[PDB]
């Protein structure tokens, strides 16, 4: 089936934001004369606030710039609501850390700096794109519409609706496939249910066109919709189907797209042997030829 | 009649698609919980000589010598066969010091009877939580996700060394030694791997919990409602990180309206309502200080088979006994007749 | 029950960049989907083509239209009320056991397993045959046993249907019609034992009793067929969890964390892994359809040979006994057959006569190899299958040119006391 | 396929429904096909039925019960007494060699006398009457 | 039958394309032939695969 | 001839830490063992039932 609103859910928090200002100073192209990279003035910095933003600034005299990243995230993507339980950045080597290499091409390129990222996963620290202002509750979402979301670390698109279910444990619930199915709003206790923005459906193709659609949605571009037990059927013909073209089980679809049920197939009546009374004896026989194919070899 | 007791004789309990119960004895009973007209969930003989069956919610309890617990979504309203037909529950406080039939008392229960009964149990000699316990505020501890429904075999801090009922602290709980206090029922002389706190009224603590790390940093939970002399620049909780040369306050969370359980492990994981919210470094001890809990228990991590319904815990089987170890491997509380592979 | 899987949704679950990458593998998706759509179409055609229904016969299978006589059939026949399942059919379906997808698009509830599989692109189709159609089919086959002809006032009394079947095994000479009552009573006991076997068989069943062609065996088989039905669906679904050497198992995760080209590279790893999972699913699914077709072909042979007709193949219907008639009941995913077979309780010990010789001129033997001449229990003939004696007649014997040492030495004046209808015409004419 | 050739092509199957399905088998033809064989099964299908009343058997003068020897042959009076295979309405009059004697009569047998027998079974001869008269 | 083998699809009903019919048998023959090389191409395509080299 | 395989021994050959890790996959082991134990039981019943 067939500009998304952005939704974002974390464990409840208020605006608590700090910046990680990474400044790369350099002068050249005859390579470098000098360079120096600092993070908030310091040689290293760790985040101690619930939200943070990384902002990379260049102060380079002569230059094209780019990054080579061995991390799960880039310096720009780290600010798209990714969540961590711990997060430290250093120009020095940290144990168990990934590296982002910052290069310049001055017009004979050079490496300006190596940023080492030491982190662990969880909900406490979130790389939001900016500070929040006038915000008592950082989390937000738009309901009953297709939205792009980041919920408790899960990203994707879907429709978030409110359910009447209630659970006493944890924060979120998932499928066997690892997808988010539902999540809890910790402050209110409400549980929300998340569905895909599009669904699989079966189309009836006859001749050269789509004659109708069997689906889970009541909304389509067809002008006639019927509700069948277990599915909806879209067509441009809502009448009884008497001459099916496509058949599955007892469901038949006519070339006009009308849909109806296919009656049980009748067949040959055989007569029971009888010792006494009213019986019928077959006559006026004619030949009929049946066709069967059996494979003999491969 | 929720409860029917008796002092051939028979008991018949009914609502047709589900199970209905029949029991018959004469002066051992045959108990049959089956899809009776006008197969079986249970069909066996039970020792017998009062005798009675009580059913509420989705549990049926059979009282005939050993108390048997059957877990099933039953729907019963009337019962047919001196007899006692019981439609209203009661409560008794039992004082057992004697470890035999000569219980000291069955005193009428006068206060907080529902809560006490739901949260307080005596520990068995092997550290097991006795069958029939409701696990009212007990949660499975999961860092991510929640098992809403199904049967799981998992390693959880469910083995009880010591349970302190209705504690009064006015106490240092070490992870290297046993916990001081008077244990309810059996006790095991082992240090905890985890401390499980079953909360009655959180305002008692909000009105002190300190995690003492291995390297000497003291982590204190500080919560406040509309008062922030040192916190500024509904309760909000901050983690005071107190080291020898520095004290800072890290904001952790807005306090959830209801907190039923907090579990603090030796490895530092802190779980509130089963979500593994904060992981710290290794802990040596937890200090509790207040003038609030139903229970505090010292537990250890064991493999167990847990049935989960609506995220709630029921029917925990411990994988210690060889029979139980087989049941854990087949992920089933009941295993049919057959040959099974064991080592 | 057929399954159909949307390749793109399974592999690229709504991510449009992923779908653009997937395009280079479109042929794989076409192959996967074609195999599942065509196989489902074929199963639909063959099952519905096979299960035809006779209206003349269906009408004779109700409690009131089926004129059982002695023989009970209450727990076999359907229930007029619109018509419902028979008692035995109801026990089997309730003991062991189409999806609604209109709800999966609503949100409002937390998705269950079916909706979660649906969201992933896996659709479980409606059954090719409804349970009510299996019921009407079975009712037609039973009602047909009493369809002795058309336009008649009433269904053939069941006992006449039985007497005709008995005559085919052996001509009956005991025509007192008491034997029909005795057989009806054993029939009714057998139905009662089956009906009861379906209700807590495990309370007292021996190794002999739970073996082949028994209720416990057949019932166990029905449960295994039903219990394993979703086994492949959950392997396909679980594999979506798998991280095929990427930052995340989630495509949206990868594109939202890495730059586009690095993300492309990892999404392609996930695509290959997901296409592999689909191919494994299809291979398992197609294999299962083949096994079921083999069972379906046998079921069709059993209906045509054990239900609509009386098999002459020893051991085919029921096994180890003489077949009279079989009944069919609807069952989860198929049909259950009740084979009514005669078993002897006693044997009559007689001495067989190879043949007769008359006055050293004529050797007389029986024409039919299945008929035996004997003197114990006067000369009589009976089918070798049942001790149903009658005296021999002239039309029973043929002339053989030579005698053997095993033939009885008779004269012409004794012949008439061996074969009562034998006439020596010359003596009657001369004397 | 081998069973079909041996049973439907080289011989006439007695198994209802094996060859063709739902009808009376006469003969089958085989044609070559890609990777195997295609069978053409020629089967008879009735167009009409003849409605008759079946006779369970005859009794003669309360002494002899006469029934047909072959279970697949049916005695009837509609469409004079005739016999035909239950499979096809191909009547002929019955003969002596069609019947056997049964010790007992039932309520469903026709009550005949010896002077009527010959008009039921044309080849029946009462030898004593021919000899005495 | 002879005619059924030549454009059966122009006017064939659900009853007529079921078991023991020309359309069914003919469809089966095509499926047997069309799938004949299906395994050969999986074996051949896998030669393309780079097993971490 | 039927075969039966001890899932834990095959996967974790006596190592107790491995078995603790294996526990999260207990359902896989139950599935593997059940299929082999039940299939062996069925072949035993049908062959011995048939060969009277
Ligand atoms: C949410 O995520 C959390 C984070 O992953 C999960 O936390 C994990 O939980 C499990 C289960 O409890 C922990 O497993 C346990 O690990 C214990 C020790 O591991 C540290 O120390 C080891 C060195 O000493 C141990 O091992 C040696 C042999 O190597 C033995 O000789 C010693 O006696 C001792 O047992 C070391 O090898 C490990 O690498 C590890 O080091 C730590 O690494 C982290 C990484 O950053 C580092 O930060 C730490 O500082 C570092 N530690 C140090 C000291 O430097 C281990 O002892 C446990 O085995 C015992 O206990 C378990 C039950 O918990 C029993 O099953 C065992 O049989 C054994 O029992 C013994 O001790 C019991 C304790 O009282 C006692 O009662 C018994 O009688 C018996 O004597 C166990 O394997 C895991 O450590 C932990 N993760 C981390 C990294 O902390 C949560 O589970 C998860 N929550 C959920 C469920 O959702
Ligand atoms: C999870 O549920 C909670 C609780 O309902 C939601 O928080 C609620 O958010 C609304 C909208 O911002 C708040 O209303 C506001 O009140 C302030 C005054 O306090 C007013 O100035 C604003 O104009 C607005 O009306 C409401 O106070 C707040 N409730 C509580 C107790 O937190 C929350 O929005 C939900 N989570 C997400 C994803 O937003
Ligand atoms: C990092 O850079 C940010 C800019 O993104 C600095 O924040 C600015 O601070 C100046 C101080 O006069 C204000 O005028 C701006 O309004 C601020 N901008 C924003 C977007 O906040 C911040 O000072 C730097 N942080 C550190 C730690 O050096
Ligand atoms: C860009 O880098 C230059 C150095 O190349 C910085 O200039 C220095 O500023 C520091 C701090 O005030 C002084 O101590 C040095 O004397 C300056 N060096 C020079 C070359 O004059 C400059 O501050 C940087 N600009 C930004 C945007 O930070
Ligand atoms: C849906 O739209 C179709 C057109 O695509 C409608 O069919 C037309 O009906 C009008 C009625 O006045 C006729 O005049 C036209 O000749 C029809 N067009 C076609 C397809 O030939 C159809 O009526 C609509 N479906 C429903 C719900 O009726
Ligand atoms: C398809 O045909 C069915 C059968 O006639 C229609 O169902 C009937 O709907 C009428 C409405 O006037 C009812 O009175 C009957 O009781 C229904 N019959 C039954 C039992 O199905 C159906 O309306 C037709 N579908 C469409 C939309 O054309
Ligand atoms: C963390 O708290 C503990 C417990 O109070 C402190 O340990 C105490 O240290 C004082 C120092 O005068 C001793 O008198 C007590 O005997 C100690 N008590 C215990 C039980 O150890 C410890 O100093 C604190 N750590 C920090 C960072 O201040
Ligand atoms: C034929 O079978 C029916 C059905 O089992 C028998 O009717 C049952 O009779 C019993 C007598 O105890 C009743 O309890 C059941 O309620 C009846 N069932 C139904 C549905 O009728 C009947 O007895 C049998 N008759 C013969 C002649 O055996
Ligand atoms: C077939 O059954 C008949 C009837 O039951 C058996 O005849 C019985 O024989 C026993 C021998 O102990 C006598 O006690 C009964 O009185 C007989 N019953 C009657 C009234 O006939 C007969 O034995 C069986 N046939 C064979 C071959 O044994
Ligand atoms: C029935 O007649 C046969 C044929 O004459 C007898 O068998 C013969 O017995 C004599 C005895 O001297 C032999 O010489 C012949 O060789 C035998 N002939 C055959 C056919 O082998 C037989 O003895 C007679 N049986 C009875 C019961 O009287
Ligand atoms: C078998 O076929 C014959 C021959 O067609 C049928 O006899 C015909 O009966 C119809 C009745 O409407 C007459 O109109 C024709 O004149 C008859 N044809 C002739 C010349 O016989 C006969 O009806 C069929 N048999 C049965 C049992 O109906
Ligand atoms: C044919 O003869 C039989 C046998 O005599 C008749 O059936 C008998 O009818 C009388 C009427 O009083 C009953 O007393 C007997 O019990 C019956 N005997 C049997 C065998 O049940 C029958 O009526 C005669 N039928 C015709 C067509 O005349
Ligand atoms: C005295 C401090 C005890 C209470 C500490 C509260 C801990 C943080 C509160 C937020 C918890 C959010 C994650 C778990 C909440 C939940 O699952 O309902
Ligand atoms: C060391 C063990 C040797 C194994 C010998 C096996 C002999 C007995 C068979 C036990 C397994 C039978 C398969 C399961 C049958 C059942 O479920 O009843
Ligand atoms: C409440 O949620 C349950 C979940 O199963 C659902 O079945 C029911 O329809 C819901 N009730 C309401 C209020 O709609
Ligand atoms: C139970 O009796 C014991 C005596 O051993 C006593 O110490 C304790 O206070 C009593 N507990 C209650 C329930 O009062
Ligand atoms: C306390 O921990 C130390 C660590 O070495 C250990 O040696 C000692 O046995 C522990 N004390 C107790 C009471 O177990
Ligand atoms: C039975 O046969 C008779 C005579 O052939 C006929 O009159 C009747 O209509 C037939 N059907 C019935 C009503 O039994
Ligand atoms: C009876 O006479 C006929 C006259 O043709 C003769 O053929 C036959 O052999 C004789 N039968 C006997 C018993 O001799
Ligand atoms: C005719 O006479 C013969 C002479 O043996 C006798 O056996 C037979 O019973 C008689 N038949 C009739 C019709 O009485």
Q: What is the DSSP string of C303-348?
A: IIIIISS---STTTSSSSSEEEEEEEEEETTEEEEEEEEE--S---
| Chain B partners within 8 Å of F30 (Cβ) | 329-331
Distance, in Å, from the CA atom of C53 to the CA atom of A269, rounded to the nearest integer, reads 9
Ligand 20: nearest atom to the Cα of D126: 13
Is residue C383 within a helix (H) or strand (E), and if so which, with residue range?
strand C380-383
Tokens of C100: 């609604």
Which other chains touch chain F, taking contact as 3+ CB pairs less than 8 Å apart?
B, C
Å from CA of C403 to ligand 10 middle:
10
Q: Is there an interface between B and E (3+ Cβ pairs < 8 A)? A: no
| Residue E31 CB-half CA count within 13 A | 14
Q: Please name every residue paired with D85 in a beta bridge, in sequence order, or none if there are none.
A: D73
CB contact under 8 A, B39 and C200: yes
CB contact under 8 A, B40 and C110: no
In B112-226, which ranges are E strands?
149-165, 172-174, 194-199, 209-213, 218-224
Tokens of A6: 């952005």
Written as one string, the DSSP assignment of B301-340 is EEEEEEEEETTEEEEEEES-SHHHHHHHHTT-SS--SS--
CB contact under 8 A, A295 and E25: no
- Output the residue whose Cα is nearest ligand 10's atom 7: C405
- In chain B, which residue ranges form alpha helices assigned H by DSSP? 113-119, 203-206, 322-329
Distance, in Å, from the CA atom of C361 to the CA atom of A42, rounded to the nearest integer, reads 133
In sequence order, the 6+-apart residues with CB closer than 8 A to the CB of A4 are A146, A147, A148, A157
| CB D92, CB D84: distance < 8 Å | yes
CB contact under 8 A, A289 and E29: no
Is D53 near ligand 12, meaning CB less than 6 Å away?
no
Å from CA of B75 to ligand 15 middle:
19
Is residue B178 within a helix (H) or strand (E), and if so which, with residue range?
none
Nearest ligand to the C-alpha atom of residue B37: 8
| Residue A165 CB-half CA count within 13 A | 23
Is residue B256 within a helix (H) or strand (E), and if so which, with residue range?
none
- Output the residue whose Cα is nearest ligand 8's atom 24: C72
| Residue A279 CB-half CA count within 13 A | 31
Q: Please state the separation of Cα B299 from the chain's center in Å.
A: 12
Closest CA relative to residue C236, chosen from C122, C313, C378, C142: C122
| Residue A264 CB-half CA count within 13 A | 19
Vertex A93 angle, CA A87 and A98, to 5°: 55
Distance, in Å, from the CA atom of B4 to the CA atom of B53, rounded to the nearest integer, reads 6
DSSP 3-state of C380? strand
CB contact under 8 A, E33 and D35: yes
In sequence order, the 6+-apart residues with CB closer than 8 A to the CB of C426 are none
| CB C382, CB C173: distance < 8 Å | yes
State whether the Cα torsion C282-C287-C288-C294 is positive or negative. Answer: positive
CB atoms within 10 A of CB B294: 23
Q: Is C301 near chain D, with CB under 8 Å?
A: yes
Tokens of B130: 């006795």
Distance, in Å, from the CA atom of A204 to the CA atom of D121, rounded to the nearest integer, reads 67
Is A166 near ligand 15, meaning CB less than 6 Å away?
no
Separation in Å, CA A211 to CA A203, A246, B40, C37, C101: 8, 10, 51, 18, 21
Is B277 near ligand 13, meaning CB less than 6 Å away?
yes
State whether the Cα torsion B181-B182-B183-B186 is positive or negative. Answer: positive
Burial of C109 (0-12, 13-18, 19+ CB in 10 A): middle
Pairing of strands A6-9, A259-261: unpaired
Is C409 near ligand 10, meaning CB less than 6 Å away?
yes
| CB A202, CB A214: distance < 8 Å | yes
Closest CA relative to residue B209, chosen from B296, B274, B267: B296
Pairing of strands A51-61, A17-27: parallel
In sequence order, the 6+-apart residues with CB closer than 8 A to the CB of A72 are A98, C247, C257, C258
Closest CA relative to residue A157, chosen from A198, A206, A117, A214: A198
Question: In terms of residue numbers, what domain contains A31?
Answer: 7-127
HEC string of chain A equals CCCCCEEEECCCCCCCEEEEEEEEEEECCCCCCEEEEEECCECEEECCCCEEEEEEEEEEECCEEEEEECCCCCCCHHHCCEEEEEEEEECCCCCCCEEEEEEEECCCCEEEEEEEEEEEEEEEEEECCCCCCCCCCCCECCCCCEEEEEECCEEEEEEEEECCCCCCCCCEEECCCCCEEEEECCCCCCEEEEECCCCCCEEEEECCEEEEEEECCCCCCCCEEEEECCEEEEECCCCCCCCEEEEECCEEEECCCCEEECCCCCCCCCCCCCCCEEEEEEECCEEEEEEEEEECCC
Tokens of B135: 């696990």
Distance, in Å, from the CA atom of B218 to the CA atom of B285, rounded to the nearest integer, reads 10
Pairing of strands A64-69, C362-366: unpaired
Å from CA of A143 to ligand 10 middle:
109
DSSP designation for D6: I
Tokens of C367: 């024409």
| CB F4, CB F37: distance < 8 Å | yes
| CB C368, CB C305: distance < 8 Å | no
Å from CA of E20 to ligand 12 middle:
51
Is residue C289 within a helix (H) or strand (E), and if so which, with residue range?
helix C260-302
DSSP 3-state of B54? strand
Distance, in Å, from the CA atom of B301 to the CA atom of C124, rounded to the nearest integer, reads 41
Hey, what's the torsion of the CAs at C337, C338, C341, C345, to 10 degrees? 140
Å from CA of A239 to ligand 6 middle:
10
Which other chains touch chain D, taking contact as 3+ CB pairs less than 8 Å apart?
A, C, E
Distance, in Å, from the CA atom of A14 to the CA atom of A136, rounded to the nearest integer, reads 5
DSSP 3-state of E19? coil
State whether the Cα torsion F43-F46-F50-F52 is positive or negative. Answer: positive
Closest CA relative to residue A132, chosen from A12, A49, A17: A17
Residue with tokens 């291979």: C283
Distance, in Å, from the CA atom of B246 to the CA atom of B86, rounded to the nearest integer, reads 63
CB atoms within 10 A of CB B193: 17
PDB resolution in Å: 3.5
Separation in Å, CA A5 to CA A163, C344, D47: 21, 81, 71
Is C402 near ligand 10, meaning CB less than 6 Å away?
no
Separation in Å, CA B59 to CA A220, B76, B149, C317: 48, 11, 17, 48
Distance, in Å, from the CA atom of C70 to the CA atom of B47, rounded to the nearest integer, reads 46
CB contact under 8 A, A124 and B278: yes
Separation in Å, CA B35 to CA B22, B55, C221: 11, 17, 22
| CB C274, CB A212: distance < 8 Å | no
Å from CA of C388 to ligand 9 middle:
15
- Pocket probe mutation, ligand 20, options D61, D117, D127, max atoms within 8 Å of Cβ: D127
Written as one string, the DSSP assignment of D54-85 is E---EEETTTEEEEES-TTEEEES----EEEE
Hey, what's the torsion of the CAs at A139, A144, A148, A149, to 10 degrees? 40
DSSP designation for D126: -
CATH, residue A86:
2.60.40.3130
Distance, in Å, from the CA atom of B64 to the CA atom of B51, rounded to the nearest integer, reads 5
**Testing the interface with D: which of C141, C173, C175, C177 to mutate, by most D Cβ within 10 A?**
C175
Tokens of B341: 């592979």
| CB A163, CB C108: distance < 8 Å | yes
Hey, what's the torsion of the CAs at A249, A254, A259, A265, to 10 degrees? -40
Breaks following residues of chain B (C-to-N distance > 2.5 Å): 7, 15, 27, 38, 49, 81, 170, 207, 233, 291
| Residue B188 CB-half CA count within 13 A | 19
| CB B139, CB B156: distance < 8 Å | no
CB atoms within 10 A of CB C96: 16
Residue with tokens 């290499």: A101
Residue length of chain D: 133
**Testing the interface with E: which of C43, C45, C293 to mutate, by most E Cβ within 10 A?**
C45
In sequence order, the 6+-apart residues with CB closer than 8 A to the CB of D80 are D93
| Residue B35 CB-half CA count within 13 A | 11
Tokens of A96: 């168990």
Burial of F14 (0-12, 13-18, 19+ CB in 10 A): exposed
């Amino acid at each position: 089936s067939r500009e998304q609103p952005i939704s974002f859910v974390t464990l409840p928090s208020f605006n608590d934001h700090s910046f990680v200002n990474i400044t790369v100073s350099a002068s050249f192209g005859a390579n470098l004369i000098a360079s120096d990279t600092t993070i908030n003035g310091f040689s290293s910095f760790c985040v101690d606030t619930r939200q943070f933003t990384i902002s990379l600034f260049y102060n380079v005299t002569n230059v094209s710039k780019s990054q080579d990243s061995n991390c799960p995230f880039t310096l720009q993507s780290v600010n798209d609501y990714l969540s961590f339980s711990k997060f430290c950045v250093s120009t020095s080597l940290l144990a168990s850390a990934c590296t982002i290499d910052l290069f310049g091409y001055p017009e004979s390129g050079v490496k300006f700096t190596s940023l080492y990222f030491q982190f662990t996963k969880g909900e406490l620290i979130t790389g939001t794109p900016k500070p929040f202002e006038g915000v008592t509750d950082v989390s937000f979402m738009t309901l009953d519409v297709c939205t792009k979301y980041t919920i408790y670390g899960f990203k994707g698109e879907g429709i978030i609706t409110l359910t009447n279910s209630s659970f006493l444990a944890g924060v979120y619930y998932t499928s066997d496939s690892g997808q988010l199915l539902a999540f809890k709003n910790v402050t209110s206790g409400a549980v929300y249910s998340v569905t895909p923005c599009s669904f699989s459906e079966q189309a009836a193709y006859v001749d050269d066109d789509i004659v109708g659609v069997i689906s889970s949605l009541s909304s389509s571009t067809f002008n006639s919709t019927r509700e069948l037990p277990g599915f909806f059927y879209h067509s441009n013909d809502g009448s009884n189907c008497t001459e099916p073209v496509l058949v599955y089980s007892n469901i038949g679809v006519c070339k006009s797209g009308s849909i109806g049920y296919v009656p049980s197939q009748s067949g040959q009546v055989k007569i029971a042997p009888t010792v006494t009374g009213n019986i019928s004896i077959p006559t006026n026989f004619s030949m009929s030829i049946r066709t069967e194919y059996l494979q003999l070899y491969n | 009649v929720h409860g029917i007791f008796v002092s051939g004789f028979e008991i018949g309990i009914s609502q047709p698609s589900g199970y209905q119960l029949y029991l018959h004895k004469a002066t051992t009973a045959r108990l049959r919980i089956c899809q009776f007209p006008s197969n079986c969930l249970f069909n066996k003989a039970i020792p017998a000589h009062v005798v009675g069956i009580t059913w509420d919610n989705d549990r049926v309890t059979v009282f005939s010598d050993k108390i048997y617990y059957f877990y099933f979504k039953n729907d019963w309203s009337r019962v047919a066969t001196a007899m006692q037909y019981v439609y209203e529950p009661t409560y008794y406080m039992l004082n057992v010091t004697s470890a035999g039939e000569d219980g000291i008392s069955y005193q009428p229960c006068t206060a907080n009877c529902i809560g006490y009964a739901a949260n307080v149990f005596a520990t068995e000699p092997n550290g097991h939580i006795p069958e029939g316990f409701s696990f009212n505020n007990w949660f499975l501890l999961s860092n991510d996700s929640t098992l809403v429904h199904g049967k799981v075999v998992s390693n959880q801090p469910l083995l009880v060394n010591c349970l302190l009922a209705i504690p009064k602290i006015y106490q240092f709980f070490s992870f290297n030694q046993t916990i001081d206090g008077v244990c309810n029922g059996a006790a095991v002389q082992r240090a905890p791997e985890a401390l499980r706190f079953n909360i009655n009224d959180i305002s008692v603590i909000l009105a002190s919990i300190v995690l003492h790390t291995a390297l000497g940093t003291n982590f204190s939970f500080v919560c406040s409602n509309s008062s922030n002399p040192h916190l500024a620049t509904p309760y909000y909780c901050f983690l005071k990180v107190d080291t020898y040369n520095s004290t800072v306050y890290k904001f952790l969370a807005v306090l959830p309206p209801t907190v039923r359980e907090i579990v603090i492990t030796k490895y530092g994981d802190v779980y509130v309502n089963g979500f593994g919210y904060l992981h710290l470094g290794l802990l040596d001890a937890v200090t509790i200080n207040f003038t609030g809990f139903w229970t505090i228990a010292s537990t250890n991590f064991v493999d167990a088979l847990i049935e989960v319904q609506g995220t709630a815990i029921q029917r925990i089987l411990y994988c210690d006994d060889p029979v139980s170890q087989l049941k854990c491997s087949q992920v089933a509380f009941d295993l049919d007749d057959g040959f099974y592979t064991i080592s | 029950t057929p399954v159909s899987v949307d390749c793109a949704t399974y592999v690229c679950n709504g991510n449009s960049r992923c779908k653009q990458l997937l395009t280079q593998y479109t042929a794989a998706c076409k192959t996967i989907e074609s195999a599942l759509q065509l196989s489902a179409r074929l199963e639909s055609v063959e099952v519905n083509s096979m299960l035809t229904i006779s209206d003349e016969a269906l009408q004779l299978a109700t409690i009131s239209s089926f004129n059982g006589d002695g023989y009970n059939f209450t727990n076999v026949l359907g229930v007029s009320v619109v018509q419902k399942r028979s008692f035995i059919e109801d026990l089997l379906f309730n003991k062991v056991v189409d999806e609604d997808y209109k709800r999966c698009s609503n949100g409002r509830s937390v998705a269950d397993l079916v909706c979660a599989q649906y969201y992933s692109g896996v659709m479980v189709l409606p059954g090719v045959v409804d349970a009510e159609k299996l019921h009407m089919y079975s009712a037609s086959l039973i009602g047909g046993m009493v369809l002795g002809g058309f336009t008649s006032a009433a269904a053939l009394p069941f006992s006449y249907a039985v007497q005709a079947r008995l005559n085919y095994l052996a001509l009956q000479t005991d025509v007192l019609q008491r034997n029909q009552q005795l057989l009806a009573e054993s029939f009714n006991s057998a139905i009662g034992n089956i009906t009861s076997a379906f209700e807590s068989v495990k309370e007292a069943i021996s190794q002999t009793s739970k073996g082949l062609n028994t209720v416990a065996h057949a019932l166990t088989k029905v449960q295994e067929v039903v219990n394993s039905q979703g086994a492949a669906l959950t392997q396909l679904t679980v594999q979506l969890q798998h991280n095929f050497q990427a930052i995340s198992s989630s495509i949206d995760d990868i594109y939202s964390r890495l730059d586009i080209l690095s993300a492309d590279a990892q999404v392609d790893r996930l695509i290959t892994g997901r296409l592999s999972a689909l191919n494994a699913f299809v291979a398992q699914t197609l294999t299962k359809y083949t096994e079921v077709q083999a069972s379906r072909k046998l079921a069709q042979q059993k209906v045509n040979e054990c239900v609509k007709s009386q098999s002459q193949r020893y051991g085919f219907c029921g096994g180890d006994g003489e077949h009279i008639f079989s009944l069919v009941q609807a069952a989860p995913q198929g049909l259950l057959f009740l084979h009514t077979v005669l078993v002897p309780s006693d044997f009559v010990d007689v001495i067989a006569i190879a043949g007769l010789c008359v006055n050293d001129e004529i050797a007389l033997t029986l024409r039919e190899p299945g008929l035996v001449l004997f003197t114990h229990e006067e000369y009589f003939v009976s089918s070798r299958r049942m001790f149903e004696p009658r005296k021999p007649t002239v039309s029973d014997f043929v002339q053989i040119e030579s005698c053997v040492v095993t033939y009885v030495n008779l004269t012409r004046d004794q012949l008439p006391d061996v074969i009562p209808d034998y006439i020596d015409v010359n003596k009657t004419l001369d004397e």
